[PDB]
CSV table of C-alpha atoms in Angstrom, one decimal:
chain,number,residue,atom,x,y,z
A,1,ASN,CA,12.8,47.6,-43.5
A,2,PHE,CA,12.8,44.3,-45.5
A,3,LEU,CA,16.2,43.1,-44.8
A,4,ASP,CA,15.7,43.4,-41.1
A,5,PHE,CA,12.5,41.3,-41.4
A,6,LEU,CA,14.3,38.6,-43.3
A,7,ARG,CA,17.3,38.5,-40.9
A,8,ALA,CA,14.8,38.5,-37.9
A,9,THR,CA,12.8,35.6,-39.3
A,10,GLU,CA,15.9,33.7,-40.3
A,11,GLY,CA,17.1,33.9,-36.7
A,12,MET,CA,13.8,32.6,-35.4
A,13,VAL,CA,14.0,29.7,-37.9
A,14,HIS,CA,17.6,29.1,-36.7
A,15,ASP,CA,16.5,29.2,-33.1
A,16,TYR,CA,13.6,26.8,-33.8
A,17,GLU,CA,15.6,24.2,-35.6
A,18,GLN,CA,18.4,24.2,-33.0
A,19,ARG,CA,16.0,23.8,-30.1
A,20,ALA,CA,13.8,21.2,-31.8
A,21,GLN,CA,16.8,19.1,-32.5
A,22,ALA,CA,18.0,19.5,-28.9
A,23,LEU,CA,14.6,18.7,-27.6
A,24,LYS,CA,14.5,15.4,-29.8
A,25,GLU,CA,17.9,14.4,-28.5
A,26,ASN,CA,16.9,15.1,-24.9
A,27,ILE,CA,13.6,13.1,-25.1
A,28,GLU,CA,15.5,10.3,-26.9
A,29,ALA,CA,18.1,10.1,-24.0
A,30,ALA,CA,15.3,10.2,-21.4
A,31,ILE,CA,13.1,7.5,-23.1
A,32,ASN,CA,16.1,5.2,-23.6
A,33,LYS,CA,17.0,5.6,-19.9
A,34,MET,CA,13.4,4.7,-18.8
A,35,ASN,CA,13.4,1.6,-21.1
A,36,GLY,CA,16.7,0.5,-19.8
A,37,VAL,CA,15.7,0.5,-16.1
A,38,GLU,CA,15.6,-3.1,-14.7
A,39,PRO,CA,13.3,-3.2,-11.7
A,40,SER,CA,15.0,-4.6,-8.5
A,41,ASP,CA,13.5,-7.4,-6.3
A,42,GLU,CA,14.8,-5.8,-3.1
A,43,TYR,CA,12.5,-3.4,-1.3
A,44,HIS,CA,14.5,-0.3,-0.7
A,45,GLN,CA,16.0,-0.4,-4.2
A,46,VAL,CA,12.6,-0.5,-5.9
A,47,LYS,CA,11.4,2.3,-3.7
A,48,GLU,CA,14.4,4.4,-4.8
A,49,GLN,CA,13.7,3.4,-8.5
A,50,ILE,CA,10.1,4.5,-8.0
A,51,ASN,CA,11.4,7.9,-6.4
A,52,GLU,CA,13.7,8.3,-9.4
A,53,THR,CA,10.6,8.5,-11.6
A,54,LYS,CA,9.2,11.4,-9.5
A,55,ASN,CA,12.5,13.3,-10.3
A,56,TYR,CA,11.6,12.9,-14.0
A,57,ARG,CA,7.9,13.9,-13.4
A,58,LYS,CA,8.8,17.2,-11.6
A,59,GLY,CA,11.9,18.0,-13.8
A,60,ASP,CA,12.6,17.2,-17.3
A,61,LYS,CA,9.1,16.0,-17.9
A,62,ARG,CA,7.7,19.6,-17.5
A,63,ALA,CA,10.7,21.0,-19.2
A,64,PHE,CA,10.0,18.8,-22.4
A,65,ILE,CA,6.3,19.6,-22.3
A,66,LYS,CA,6.8,23.4,-22.0
A,67,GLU,CA,9.6,23.4,-24.7
A,68,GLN,CA,7.4,21.5,-27.1
A,69,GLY,CA,4.5,24.1,-26.6
A,70,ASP,CA,7.0,27.0,-26.8
A,71,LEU,CA,8.4,25.6,-30.2
A,72,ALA,CA,4.9,25.0,-31.4
A,73,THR,CA,4.1,28.6,-30.8
A,74,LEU,CA,7.4,29.8,-32.4
A,75,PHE,CA,6.6,27.7,-35.5
A,76,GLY,CA,3.2,29.3,-35.8
A,77,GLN,CA,4.8,32.7,-35.1
A,78,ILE,CA,7.3,32.2,-37.9
A,79,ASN,CA,4.7,31.2,-40.4
A,80,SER,CA,2.4,34.1,-39.2
A,81,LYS,CA,5.1,36.7,-40.0
A,82,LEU,CA,6.0,35.1,-43.3
A,83,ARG,CA,2.3,35.1,-44.4
A,84,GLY,CA,1.9,38.7,-43.5
A,85,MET,CA,4.8,39.5,-45.7
A,86,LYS,CA,3.8,37.3,-48.5
A,87,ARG,CA,6.8,35.1,-48.1
A,88,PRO,CA,7.2,31.4,-48.8
A,89,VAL,CA,6.0,29.1,-46.0
A,90,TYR,CA,8.6,27.9,-43.5
A,91,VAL,CA,8.9,24.0,-43.5
A,92,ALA,CA,10.8,22.5,-40.6
A,93,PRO,CA,13.3,19.8,-41.1
A,94,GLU,CA,12.0,16.3,-41.4
A,95,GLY,CA,10.9,15.0,-37.9
A,96,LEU,CA,11.4,18.4,-36.2
A,97,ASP,CA,8.0,20.0,-37.1
A,98,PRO,CA,5.8,20.8,-34.1
A,99,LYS,CA,3.5,17.7,-34.7
A,100,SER,CA,6.6,15.4,-34.7
A,101,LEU,CA,7.8,17.0,-31.5
A,102,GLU,CA,4.3,16.5,-30.1
A,103,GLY,CA,4.5,12.8,-31.0
A,104,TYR,CA,7.8,12.5,-29.2
A,105,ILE,CA,6.1,13.9,-26.1
A,106,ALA,CA,3.5,11.2,-26.4
A,107,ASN,CA,6.3,8.6,-26.9
A,108,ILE,CA,8.0,9.4,-23.7
A,109,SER,CA,4.7,9.7,-21.9
A,110,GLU,CA,3.9,6.2,-22.9
A,111,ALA,CA,7.4,5.1,-21.8
A,112,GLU,CA,7.0,6.9,-18.4
A,113,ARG,CA,3.7,5.0,-17.7
A,114,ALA,CA,5.1,1.7,-18.8
A,115,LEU,CA,8.1,2.2,-16.5
A,116,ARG,CA,5.9,3.2,-13.5
A,117,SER,CA,3.5,0.2,-14.1
A,118,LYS,CA,6.3,-2.4,-14.1
A,119,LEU,CA,7.9,-0.7,-11.0
A,120,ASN,CA,4.7,-0.9,-9.2
A,121,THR,CA,4.4,-4.7,-10.2
A,122,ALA,CA,7.9,-5.3,-8.9
A,123,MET,CA,7.0,-3.5,-5.6
A,124,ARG,CA,3.8,-5.6,-5.0
A,125,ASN,CA,5.8,-8.8,-5.7
A,126,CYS,CA,8.5,-7.7,-3.4
A,127,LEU,CA,5.9,-7.1,-0.6
A,128,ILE,CA,4.3,-10.4,-1.3
A,129,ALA,CA,7.7,-12.1,-0.9
A,130,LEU,CA,8.4,-10.2,2.4
A,131,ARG,CA,5.0,-11.4,3.7
A,132,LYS,CA,5.8,-15.0,2.7
A,133,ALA,CA,9.3,-14.8,4.2
A,134,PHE,CA,7.7,-14.2,7.6
A,135,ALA,CA,4.5,-16.3,7.0
A,136,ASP,CA,6.2,-19.7,6.0
A,137,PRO,CA,8.5,-20.1,9.0
A,138,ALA,CA,6.0,-18.4,11.4
A,139,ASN,CA,3.3,-20.9,10.3
A,140,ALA,CA,5.8,-23.8,10.6
A,141,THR,CA,7.0,-22.8,14.2
A,142,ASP,CA,3.4,-22.1,15.3
A,143,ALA,CA,2.4,-25.6,14.3
A,144,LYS,CA,5.5,-27.2,15.9
A,145,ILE,CA,4.9,-25.4,19.2
A,146,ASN,CA,1.2,-26.5,19.1
A,147,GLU,CA,2.2,-30.1,18.8
A,148,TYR,CA,4.0,-29.7,22.2
A,149,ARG,CA,1.1,-27.8,23.6
A,150,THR,CA,-1.3,-30.7,22.7
A,151,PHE,CA,1.1,-33.2,24.4
A,152,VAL,CA,1.5,-31.3,27.7
A,153,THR,CA,-2.3,-30.7,27.9
A,154,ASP,CA,-3.2,-34.4,27.5
A,155,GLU,CA,-4.6,-35.8,30.6
A,156,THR,CA,-5.0,-39.4,29.4
A,157,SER,CA,-1.7,-41.1,30.4
A,158,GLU,CA,-2.0,-44.0,32.6
A,159,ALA,CA,1.8,-44.7,32.6
A,160,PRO,CA,3.8,-44.7,35.9
A,161,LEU,CA,4.5,-41.2,37.3
A,162,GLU,CA,8.2,-41.6,36.7
A,163,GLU,CA,7.8,-42.5,33.1
A,164,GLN,CA,5.4,-39.6,32.7
A,165,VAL,CA,8.0,-37.2,34.0
A,166,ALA,CA,10.8,-38.7,31.9
A,167,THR,CA,8.6,-38.4,28.8
A,168,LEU,CA,7.6,-34.8,29.8
A,169,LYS,CA,11.2,-33.7,30.4
A,170,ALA,CA,12.3,-35.3,27.1
A,171,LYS,CA,9.6,-33.5,25.2
A,172,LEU,CA,10.4,-30.2,26.9
A,173,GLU,CA,14.0,-30.4,25.8
A,174,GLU,CA,12.7,-31.0,22.3
A,175,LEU,CA,10.5,-28.0,22.5
A,176,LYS,CA,13.3,-25.7,23.7
A,177,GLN,CA,15.1,-26.1,20.4
A,178,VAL,CA,12.4,-23.9,19.0
A,179,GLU,CA,13.8,-20.9,20.9
A,180,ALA,CA,16.7,-20.6,18.6
A,181,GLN,CA,14.4,-20.6,15.4
A,182,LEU,CA,12.5,-17.4,16.7
A,183,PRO,CA,15.2,-14.6,16.1
A,184,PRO,CA,15.1,-15.1,12.3
A,185,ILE,CA,11.3,-15.0,12.3
A,186,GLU,CA,11.3,-11.7,14.2
A,187,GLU,CA,13.8,-10.3,11.7
A,188,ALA,CA,11.4,-11.3,8.9
A,189,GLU,CA,8.6,-9.4,10.6
A,190,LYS,CA,10.8,-6.3,11.1
A,191,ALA,CA,11.6,-6.3,7.4
A,192,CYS,CA,7.8,-6.3,6.8
A,193,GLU,CA,7.4,-3.3,9.0
A,194,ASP,CA,10.4,-1.6,7.3
A,195,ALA,CA,8.4,-1.8,4.1
A,196,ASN,CA,5.3,-0.6,6.0
A,197,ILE,CA,3.5,-3.8,5.3
A,198,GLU,CA,0.3,-3.9,7.6
A,199,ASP,CA,-1.5,-7.1,6.5
A,200,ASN,CA,-0.4,-10.7,5.9
A,201,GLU,CA,-3.1,-12.9,4.2
A,202,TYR,CA,-0.6,-15.8,4.5
A,203,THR,CA,-0.4,-16.1,8.3
A,204,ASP,CA,-2.8,-15.7,11.3
A,205,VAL,CA,0.1,-15.3,13.8
A,206,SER,CA,2.4,-12.3,14.7
A,207,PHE,CA,5.8,-12.8,16.1
A,208,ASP,CA,4.7,-11.9,19.5
A,209,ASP,CA,1.9,-14.5,19.3
A,210,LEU,CA,4.6,-16.9,18.4
A,211,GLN,CA,7.1,-15.9,21.1
A,212,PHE,CA,4.2,-15.9,23.6
A,213,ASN,CA,3.0,-19.3,22.5
A,214,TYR,CA,6.5,-20.7,23.0
A,215,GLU,CA,7.0,-19.2,26.4
A,216,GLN,CA,3.6,-20.3,27.7
A,217,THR,CA,3.9,-23.8,26.3
A,218,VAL,CA,7.4,-24.2,28.0
A,219,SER,CA,6.0,-23.0,31.3
A,220,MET,CA,3.2,-25.5,31.1
A,221,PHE,CA,5.7,-28.2,30.7
A,222,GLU,CA,7.8,-27.0,33.6
A,223,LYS,CA,4.8,-26.6,35.9
A,224,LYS,CA,3.5,-30.1,35.1
A,225,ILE,CA,7.0,-31.6,35.8
A,226,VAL,CA,7.0,-29.9,39.1
A,227,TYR,CA,3.6,-31.1,40.3
A,228,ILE,CA,4.1,-34.6,39.2
A,229,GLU,CA,7.5,-34.7,40.9
A,230,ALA,CA,5.6,-33.5,44.0
A,231,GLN,CA,3.3,-36.5,43.6
A,232,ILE,CA,6.3,-38.9,43.5
A,233,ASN,CA,7.8,-37.4,46.7
A,234,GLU,CA,4.5,-38.0,48.4
A,235,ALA,CA,5.0,-41.7,48.2
B,1,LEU,CA,-7.2,-30.9,52.4
B,2,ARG,CA,-8.8,-27.5,52.1
B,3,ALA,CA,-6.1,-26.8,49.5
B,4,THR,CA,-8.0,-28.8,46.9
B,5,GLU,CA,-11.4,-27.5,47.9
B,6,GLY,CA,-10.2,-23.9,47.2
B,7,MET,CA,-8.5,-24.8,43.9
B,8,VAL,CA,-11.6,-26.4,42.5
B,9,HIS,CA,-13.7,-23.3,43.4
B,10,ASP,CA,-11.1,-21.2,41.9
B,11,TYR,CA,-11.0,-23.2,38.7
B,12,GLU,CA,-14.7,-23.3,38.2
B,13,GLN,CA,-15.1,-19.6,38.7
B,14,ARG,CA,-12.3,-18.8,36.3
B,15,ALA,CA,-13.4,-21.3,33.8
B,16,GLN,CA,-16.9,-19.8,33.6
B,17,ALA,CA,-15.7,-16.3,33.5
B,18,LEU,CA,-13.4,-17.2,30.6
B,19,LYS,CA,-16.2,-19.0,28.8
B,20,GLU,CA,-18.5,-15.9,29.1
B,21,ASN,CA,-15.6,-13.3,28.2
B,22,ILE,CA,-14.7,-15.3,25.0
B,23,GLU,CA,-18.4,-15.5,24.1
B,24,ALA,CA,-19.0,-11.7,24.4
B,25,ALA,CA,-15.8,-10.9,22.5
B,26,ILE,CA,-16.9,-13.2,19.7
B,27,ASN,CA,-20.3,-11.6,19.4
B,28,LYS,CA,-18.7,-8.2,19.3
B,29,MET,CA,-16.3,-9.3,16.5
B,30,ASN,CA,-19.1,-11.0,14.6
B,31,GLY,CA,-21.1,-7.8,14.9
B,32,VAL,CA,-18.6,-5.3,13.5
B,33,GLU,CA,-19.7,-3.9,10.1
B,34,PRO,CA,-16.8,-2.7,7.9
B,35,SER,CA,-16.9,1.0,7.4
B,36,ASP,CA,-16.5,2.5,3.9
B,37,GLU,CA,-14.5,5.5,5.0
B,38,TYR,CA,-10.7,5.2,5.1
B,39,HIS,CA,-10.1,6.6,8.7
B,40,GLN,CA,-13.0,4.5,10.1
B,41,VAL,CA,-11.7,1.3,8.5
B,42,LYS,CA,-8.2,2.1,9.6
B,43,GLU,CA,-9.5,2.5,13.2
B,44,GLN,CA,-11.5,-0.8,13.0
B,45,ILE,CA,-8.4,-2.5,12.0
B,46,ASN,CA,-6.5,-0.7,14.8
B,47,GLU,CA,-8.9,-2.3,17.3
B,48,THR,CA,-8.4,-5.9,16.1
B,49,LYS,CA,-4.6,-5.3,16.6
B,50,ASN,CA,-5.4,-4.1,20.1
B,51,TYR,CA,-7.5,-7.2,20.7
B,52,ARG,CA,-4.5,-9.2,19.5
B,53,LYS,CA,-2.1,-7.9,22.1
B,54,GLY,CA,-4.7,-7.3,24.8
B,55,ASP,CA,-7.6,-9.7,25.7
B,56,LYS,CA,-6.5,-12.3,23.1
B,57,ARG,CA,-3.2,-12.9,25.0
B,58,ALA,CA,-5.2,-12.8,28.4
B,59,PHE,CA,-7.7,-15.5,27.3
B,60,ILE,CA,-4.8,-17.7,25.9
B,61,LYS,CA,-2.7,-17.3,29.1
B,62,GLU,CA,-5.8,-18.0,31.2
B,63,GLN,CA,-6.8,-21.2,29.2
B,64,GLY,CA,-3.3,-22.4,29.8
B,65,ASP,CA,-3.3,-21.5,33.4
B,66,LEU,CA,-6.5,-23.3,33.9
B,67,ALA,CA,-5.3,-26.4,32.1
B,68,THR,CA,-2.3,-26.4,34.6
B,69,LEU,CA,-4.7,-25.8,37.6
B,70,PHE,CA,-6.9,-28.7,36.5
B,71,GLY,CA,-3.7,-30.8,36.3
B,72,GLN,CA,-2.6,-29.7,39.8
B,73,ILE,CA,-5.9,-30.5,41.3
B,74,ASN,CA,-6.1,-34.1,39.9
B,75,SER,CA,-2.3,-34.6,40.7
B,76,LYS,CA,-3.1,-33.7,44.4
B,77,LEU,CA,-6.2,-35.9,44.4
B,78,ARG,CA,-4.4,-38.8,43.0
B,79,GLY,CA,-1.6,-38.5,45.4
B,80,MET,CA,-4.2,-38.7,48.2
B,81,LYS,CA,-5.8,-41.8,46.6
B,82,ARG,CA,-9.0,-39.9,46.0
B,83,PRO,CA,-11.4,-39.9,43.0
B,84,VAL,CA,-10.5,-37.4,40.2
B,85,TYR,CA,-12.1,-34.1,39.8
B,86,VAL,CA,-14.4,-33.7,36.8
B,87,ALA,CA,-15.2,-30.1,35.8
B,88,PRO,CA,-18.8,-29.0,35.2
B,89,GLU,CA,-20.1,-29.4,31.6
B,90,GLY,CA,-18.4,-27.1,29.2
B,91,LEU,CA,-15.7,-25.9,31.7
B,92,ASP,CA,-13.2,-28.8,31.3
B,93,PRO,CA,-9.8,-27.7,29.8
B,94,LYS,CA,-10.7,-29.2,26.4
B,95,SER,CA,-13.9,-27.1,26.2
B,96,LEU,CA,-11.9,-24.0,27.1
B,97,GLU,CA,-9.4,-24.9,24.3
B,98,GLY,CA,-12.4,-25.0,21.9
B,99,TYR,CA,-13.6,-21.6,23.0
B,100,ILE,CA,-10.0,-20.3,22.2
B,101,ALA,CA,-10.4,-22.0,18.8
B,102,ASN,CA,-13.7,-20.3,18.4
B,103,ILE,CA,-12.5,-16.8,19.1
B,104,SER,CA,-9.4,-17.4,16.9
B,105,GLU,CA,-11.7,-18.1,14.0
B,106,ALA,CA,-13.9,-15.0,14.6
B,107,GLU,CA,-10.8,-12.9,14.8
B,108,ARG,CA,-9.6,-14.3,11.4
B,109,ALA,CA,-12.9,-13.8,9.7
B,110,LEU,CA,-13.2,-10.2,10.8
B,111,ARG,CA,-9.6,-9.4,9.9
B,112,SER,CA,-10.1,-10.4,6.3
B,113,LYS,CA,-13.4,-8.6,6.2
B,114,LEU,CA,-11.7,-5.4,7.3
B,115,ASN,CA,-8.7,-5.9,5.0
B,116,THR,CA,-11.1,-6.1,1.9
B,117,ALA,CA,-13.0,-3.0,3.1
B,118,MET,CA,-9.7,-1.2,3.2
B,119,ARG,CA,-8.7,-2.5,-0.2
B,120,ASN,CA,-11.9,-1.2,-1.7
B,121,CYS,CA,-11.6,1.9,0.2
B,122,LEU,CA,-8.2,2.8,-1.4
B,123,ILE,CA,-9.7,1.8,-4.8
B,124,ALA,CA,-12.5,4.2,-4.4
B,125,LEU,CA,-10.1,7.0,-3.3
B,126,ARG,CA,-7.9,6.3,-6.4
B,127,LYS,CA,-11.1,6.6,-8.6
B,128,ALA,CA,-12.3,9.7,-6.9
B,129,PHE,CA,-9.2,11.3,-8.2
B,130,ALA,CA,-8.8,9.5,-11.5
B,131,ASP,CA,-12.2,10.1,-13.0
B,132,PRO,CA,-12.3,14.0,-12.8
B,133,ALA,CA,-8.6,14.0,-13.5
B,134,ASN,CA,-8.9,12.0,-16.7
B,135,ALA,CA,-12.0,14.1,-17.8
B,136,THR,CA,-10.3,17.4,-17.2
B,137,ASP,CA,-7.0,16.2,-18.9
B,138,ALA,CA,-8.9,15.3,-22.0
B,139,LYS,CA,-10.8,18.6,-21.9
B,140,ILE,CA,-7.6,20.7,-21.7
B,141,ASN,CA,-6.1,18.7,-24.4
B,142,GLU,CA,-9.0,19.5,-26.7
B,143,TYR,CA,-8.1,23.1,-26.4
B,144,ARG,CA,-4.4,22.2,-26.7
B,145,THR,CA,-5.2,20.6,-30.1
B,146,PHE,CA,-7.2,23.7,-31.1
B,147,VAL,CA,-4.5,26.3,-30.5
B,148,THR,CA,-1.8,24.1,-32.1
B,149,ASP,CA,-3.8,23.8,-35.3
B,150,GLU,CA,-2.7,26.5,-37.8
B,151,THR,CA,-5.5,25.8,-40.4
B,152,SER,CA,-7.6,29.0,-40.4
B,153,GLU,CA,-8.5,30.9,-43.6
B,154,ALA,CA,-10.2,33.9,-42.0
B,155,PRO,CA,-9.5,37.6,-41.3
B,156,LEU,CA,-6.9,38.0,-38.5
B,157,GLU,CA,-9.5,40.1,-36.4
B,158,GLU,CA,-11.7,36.9,-36.6
B,159,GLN,CA,-9.0,34.5,-35.6
B,160,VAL,CA,-8.2,36.7,-32.7
B,161,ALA,CA,-11.9,36.7,-31.5
B,162,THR,CA,-12.2,33.0,-32.1
B,163,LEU,CA,-9.0,32.3,-30.1
B,164,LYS,CA,-10.3,34.6,-27.4
B,165,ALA,CA,-13.7,32.9,-27.4
B,166,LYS,CA,-12.0,29.4,-27.2
B,167,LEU,CA,-9.7,30.7,-24.4
B,168,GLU,CA,-12.6,31.9,-22.4
B,169,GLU,CA,-14.2,28.5,-22.6
B,170,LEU,CA,-10.9,26.9,-21.5
B,171,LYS,CA,-10.7,29.2,-18.5
B,172,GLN,CA,-13.9,27.6,-17.3
B,173,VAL,CA,-11.7,24.6,-16.5
B,174,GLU,CA,-9.8,26.3,-13.7
B,175,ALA,CA,-12.7,26.2,-11.4
B,176,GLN,CA,-12.7,22.4,-11.9
B,177,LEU,CA,-9.2,21.9,-10.5
B,178,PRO,CA,-9.6,22.6,-6.8
B,179,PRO,CA,-11.9,19.6,-6.3
B,180,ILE,CA,-9.3,17.4,-8.1
B,181,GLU,CA,-6.4,18.5,-5.9
B,182,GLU,CA,-8.4,17.6,-2.8
B,183,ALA,CA,-9.1,14.2,-4.3
B,184,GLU,CA,-5.3,13.8,-4.6
B,185,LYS,CA,-4.7,15.1,-1.0
B,186,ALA,CA,-7.3,12.4,0.1
B,187,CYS,CA,-5.2,9.8,-1.6
B,188,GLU,CA,-2.0,11.2,0.2
B,189,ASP,CA,-3.8,11.0,3.6
B,190,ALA,CA,-4.4,7.2,3.0
B,191,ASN,CA,-0.8,6.9,1.9
B,192,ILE,CA,-1.8,5.8,-1.5
B,193,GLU,CA,1.4,5.6,-3.7
B,194,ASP,CA,0.0,4.3,-7.1
B,195,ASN,CA,-2.9,4.9,-9.4
B,196,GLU,CA,-3.5,2.4,-12.1
B,197,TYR,CA,-6.6,4.3,-13.2
B,198,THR,CA,-4.9,7.5,-14.4
B,199,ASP,CA,-1.7,8.6,-16.1
B,200,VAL,CA,-2.0,12.2,-14.6
B,201,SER,CA,-1.1,13.6,-11.3
B,202,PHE,CA,-2.6,16.9,-10.1
B,203,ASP,CA,0.6,18.8,-10.9
B,204,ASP,CA,0.5,17.3,-14.4
B,205,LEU,CA,-3.1,18.6,-14.9
B,206,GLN,CA,-2.3,22.0,-13.4
B,207,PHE,CA,0.7,22.4,-15.6
B,208,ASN,CA,-1.2,21.2,-18.7
B,209,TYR,CA,-3.8,23.9,-18.0
B,210,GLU,CA,-1.2,26.7,-17.3
B,211,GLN,CA,0.7,25.9,-20.5
B,212,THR,CA,-2.3,25.5,-22.7
B,213,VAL,CA,-3.8,28.9,-21.5
B,214,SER,CA,-0.3,30.5,-22.2
B,215,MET,CA,-0.2,29.1,-25.7
B,216,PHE,CA,-3.5,30.8,-26.4
B,217,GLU,CA,-2.3,34.1,-24.9
B,218,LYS,CA,0.9,34.1,-26.9
B,219,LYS,CA,-0.9,33.2,-30.2
B,220,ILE,CA,-3.4,36.0,-29.5
B,221,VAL,CA,-0.4,38.5,-29.0
B,222,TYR,CA,1.4,37.6,-32.2
B,223,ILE,CA,-1.7,37.8,-34.3
B,224,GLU,CA,-2.7,41.1,-32.7
B,225,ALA,CA,0.8,42.2,-33.6
B,226,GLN,CA,0.2,41.2,-37.2
B,227,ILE,CA,-3.0,43.2,-37.2
B,228,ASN,CA,-1.1,46.5,-36.6
B,229,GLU,CA,1.4,45.6,-39.3
């Protein structure tokens, strides 16, 4: 009968209006949350921020999209039933019609892409910083060792043997100071591996290359001092 | 006496062997052609890292050992008031140091070669997903636009048929989805975590298809309901 139809279509309108408003408020809260995110400059924080965007993509993002489509269906259904009964058309409140709701879906979709893009930028810059944090002192220390490598491999001295030995011992003591500068360089490399970094355009040395260069250079100094002191004992 | 004879023969044999080993390793590196497939390029990069901790260390250690040995020989000869030992051409410690310099440069050049192949590889993997994903997303959205348009002045039986005809067209899309999921899995195998070239994941696309189909089905049902009323 006619009063049942009117009551049923009124209840559908009441359900549509309440859900459309709730959808709008929910999208508004989620888009504001996205736009409020400030990307970190620390690796594990950015990775969690990126992981947070995946919770939206798997959760409310689908909930919003489904509910917009469900409401667009319901709006069409309401007006379908009204047309069939020669009733006035149903007009949703301003900003709550299905097309407005569709536009809010596009709004948060834009905000979602924009958030993801700035998080990806912050992640690449974080990785570039981690690379440079290893490269700069690694390049410094490698060049410093190589200076001492050049000295100990020079065969050109015509100085008396005792002066050669004193000079070699003094340079070795200098080089040995480098040993204390290595632990922080290893730490920087480990931080790179913690971020799963697998290339470093900024250096051509690994920490093991550096540690090994130091140890071998020190040993060459030691062995040269020994054999020159053997020469001095033979006189 | 014979100590120096034996060290010289040992030096010259080892200096020559180091020269030839570095030379062969350089040729090998210079001859690597970067692959275009992710797993191959990954394994090419793997081998440079194994050179880095294998023969690279062995060549560097041996160059330094031979510099030391050349030093020991001449220290012994000077103590004995004898003339200095001069290595054969190309085998002196400075030449060996230059061969270390040479292979270091070949290592560097190859490593960047492989790093760009890997970058372009991950780009191609991203595009292999993005291009069909973007195309299918637009296609689904075309049918989403159709079913959410309520401008039809036609008999209900005719709207139902048109909606069923459009739905059947839309269901042709489902067969396009499995190749797109495999393109995503291929990205996940290369540990790709970002895609600048698309705004849609595979689950986004699947969901859009599932919801758009369902909106057609529900619109069919409530117009069919109006037909018998």
